[PDB]
Amino acid sequence: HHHHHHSKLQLFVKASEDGESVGHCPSCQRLFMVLLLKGVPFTLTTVDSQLPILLYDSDAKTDTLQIEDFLEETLGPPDFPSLAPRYRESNTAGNDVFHKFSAFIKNPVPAQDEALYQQLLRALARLDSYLRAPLEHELAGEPQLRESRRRFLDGDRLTLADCSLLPKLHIVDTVCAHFRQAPIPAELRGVRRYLDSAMQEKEFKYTCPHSAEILAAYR
């Protein structure tokens, strides 16, 4: 079904430095994921306003959030699965991780280093607590459940929320690990399980750019 192409729905995304494959771009990956999860035929095209961009008919859409809402609305039951999360909080948890990572990783002030890192950790901590908290349907079946059993944000299936966050969270882990020897702390069991579960899902695994690409983006 799905058609990738370098050198009808069509997604234009960034190519890698050498042009050989998919480039670093967490928004590009987000939409790549949405499209795969819809199970709709599509063409993805790498490129050497701003990407990602989507063509439907002759018509374009250039804004990540807009493209996403469109794909969620236009492609629905019974032809396509809806990917909206069920619970409000799936949409907000970890909403600040990426911003806090970016301020940490770009900081040139020695005396602010630990401080900004702590802010990063605290946000990762809150994401962790949500991932470990049993959701409604989990309790509906098991009334005394203490620790959530689920794989992802909203349950055991990838949703729009995961599509947005996983690409960002992958970068945080990749960059912090390699550059500052600061992998996601083992204490955050829910965050750790979440990244690992994601790597076992074809739609996340096969939309990841090579690690070298992410590393190069940060130098």
φ, ψ at 37 (rounded to 5°): -70, -25
Pairwise CA distance, residues 79 & 117, whole Å: 45
Label each residue of 113-151 as H, E or C. HHHHHHHHHHHHHHHHHHHHCCCHHHHHHCCCCCCCCCC
39, 58, 84: which is the final residue of a domain? 84
Q: Resolution, rounded to a tenth of an Å?
A: 2.0
Is residue 146 domain-shared with residue 219, that is, in the same domain?
yes
The answer to whether the beta carbons of residues 11 and 45 sit under 8 Å apart is yes
| Domain CATH code at residue 69 | 3.40.30.10
DSSP characters over the chain: --EEE---EEEEEEBPTTSSSBPS-HHHHHHHHHHHHHT---EEEEE---S-EEEETTEEE--HHHHHHHHHHHS-TTTS-----SSGGGGTTTTTHHHHHHHHHH---GGGHHHHHHHHHHHHHHHHHHHHSPPHHHHHH-TT--S---SSSSSSS--HHHHHHHHHHHHHHHHHHHHHS-PPPTT-HHHHHHHHHHHTSHHHHTTPPPHHHHHHHH-
Residue 24: give the domain boundaries: 1-84
